[PDB]
């Protein structure tokens, strides 16, 4: 559940760089392909989200990693595939 | 007057009778003002708002 | 009836003219909601001119702010009534004198919360008594212009409609008298040959009771059979 | 408003009420001697709090 | 052991409103008990009130009818004030026939003997002229609680609010019943105020299986 | 139509989505705040004392 | 349809530690949500059968506003830490126990004699600590049975607030829930700790035998 976001402003200092991360994250999860980090509690993906950021396993440089990994996993494929 | 008529009725002078709660069946302390207000309903109703 | 008034209350409910005040006084003859029927006095009574006075009363009707003013006859069969003495109560009296609201049993305290800036907390003996239930009348028009390609009828067959369009309506469209709608429904069949649907429809969010249907014809334009 | 009205009529205190000057094992039998109607919400005592 | 209590005396003083008497109780009990009784008795007892009304020629309640002076609509108040027992049905639909100049009461109204008028003074309303008659059909039905118009809902059958609910007005007050050698037991009188088509004791001992049944939740009967 | 099954439609969008509460002459920032919807059986926004 | 209510079943018993729980019921018809939490209010916080301590006798001591030598804390502080103490008893109305102990360190109901029916349901309980070795303290406490809180103003001879119902805090937060087409129902949110002598469920089960037992000569 969700009343207040103070952990997840204290582990992404900014207060508006929260809105951007949880929002690049709930995209990841609402079209989205992906599934989350932690047990959903019937939660939607904004609460969920938030509730990532606040465990400290979501930020940006860790979304950041993932999308390299996952291109970096496309470049194998395409080569893999082709030649 | 007002005192008067009320001691021309049984009711208690000061205005204020000792009320008891409809939840928990307990009196109220410090008793309580009790009468006939004369209340309106006046035509800003709500299902004409919403 | 205010228990607590300043005794103008007389003066206001006579002088505007929504109560019934009798013109010439004498013996009831004869009361109905509809009309009060007054045998006069001889001294009150003109020699020719034989006379008795039969006020009607004004029903069920839509004030300027959509309000009922109705009038009662608050004077039984066989009575003494004087001259400048009121018969029937308008709206907002009670014999004669000035009623707007009502007189509850007021309690100051404050209780649980629900009355916190100017909240008002009210039982359900006030509403169960109807002793706030207050009448609303609206006025509803429906128009048959004139028209390019055609004028547009006030037929009761609907295109794209069903049974539970025509169940509601007559053999010429209009609703029936007395007949309980809801948002959403069909009070009068209106169609514009392109056809397309142009009926009457009660507003959304409003229930009520057709009262009373007025139809306007202009003088060339012949009648259907509810005229 | 309300809320500070409630609060002002509880923490408060007069010389004598119910349970005058006795001692209670905590708050948690503070609000049971109220409860039951053995003290009353402004009479002075000594509590043990931590 | 506790001590358990017994409707040892009920005072049907007037036809509308009695007292009846617990005794023995316990010291703490005579509070708890009254207010759970009170508690139950206004909020759920089986009434019987009218329900949907069908005078003759009337289109709906917003109008009046030639012969009486009142309205369909204080006609259908003083109905909605009307207090009736019905015996071994649910729904019962009683009728009215009158003409003649003067007052039409509850009872002009025909018996139905499985039917019980209470108050057969009640008056519904006046007829003003010689050939001039109402004649209405009344559904009178059982429920419980307070079922307005709007939300459970041809068309000259008027819906009426249904107010099912005997009692109007209950108070319980304890007192010491010096007795037993034993002192320190209070008493419970409970002062009820009916309409009248409930007796005392039905109503004390339905409240009281009302509360055996919601305890029922968890301990064991 | 409103059927039966559309009002638990309707408390699983409500759940953890706020909505902007906003009183009409907004004069500062605390004038705009956002809520998470209770449904009200009623047609009055049942406001919280304090706010 | 007239006798047909929505009787409920609690939903969950959402606990803390074993003297504590905080159960709900729904759905409960509206209006019953405030009966059936006054009503067991006042019957668990008003009349439970317990055992608690009643009356002390200190051995050197003639009077509440007293003074001890090599005792850390006072007779007011020490009827503070006695008017705690939790005690189960079998059939024995009441019994007196003696504590005898002298020593550097605390001075719990452990150090209490046990012989009798007597059980405790704290060995930690700490009723006084002590900071001498030859500081020797020697009490006489009472339990007795009763019916709730009997306070020292109504009851060398010391006067002990007993305390006999087991239950410390109970309150009840009746909240709204709803049934699939119903309008407005209650949901009853018991919150209730004990002393230990008995567990919270069971104390709940306690209240319901006696309120469905006082309504046995109507139903």
Known sequence: ARVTVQDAVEKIGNRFDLVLVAARRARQMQVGGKDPLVPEENDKTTVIALREIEEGLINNQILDVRERQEQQEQEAAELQAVT | EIKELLKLGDLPTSGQIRLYDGRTGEQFERPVTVGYMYMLKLNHLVDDKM | KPLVGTGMERAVAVDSGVTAVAKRGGVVQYVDASRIVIKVNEDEMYPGEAGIDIYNLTKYTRSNQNTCINQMPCVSLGEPVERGDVLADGPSTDLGELALGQNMRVAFMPWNGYNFEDSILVSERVVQEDRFTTIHIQELACVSRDTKLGPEEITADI????????????????????AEVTGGDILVGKVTPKVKDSSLRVPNGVSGTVIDVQVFTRDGVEKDKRA | QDVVLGLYYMTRDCVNAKGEGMVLTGPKEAERLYRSGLASLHARVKVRIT | EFLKPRLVDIEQVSSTHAKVTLEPLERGFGH?????????????????????????????????????????????????????????????????????????????????????IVKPQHVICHLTDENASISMRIKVQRGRGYVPASTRIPIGRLLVDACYSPVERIAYNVEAARVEQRTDLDKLVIEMETNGTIDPEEAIRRAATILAEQLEAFVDL | REEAVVWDILDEVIREHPVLLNRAPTLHRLGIQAFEPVLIEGKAIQLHPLV
């Open chain 5, 32 to 116: 708890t008990l009254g207010n759970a009784l009170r508690r139950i008795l206004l909020s759920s007892m089986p009434g019987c009130a009218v329900t949907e009304v069908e005078i003759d020629g009337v289109l709906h309640e917003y109008s009046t009818k030639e012969g009486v002076q009142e309205d369909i609509l204080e006609i259908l108040l003083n109905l909605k004030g009307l207090a009736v027992r019905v015996q071994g049905k649910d729904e019962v639909i009683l009728t009215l026939n009158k003409s003649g100049i003067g007052p039409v009461t509850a009872a002009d109204i025909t018996h139905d003997g499985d039917v019980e």
């Open chain 3, 159 to 178: 295109p794209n409609v069903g049974e539970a369009a025509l169940s509601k309506l007559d053999e010429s469209g209009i609703v029936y008298i007395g």
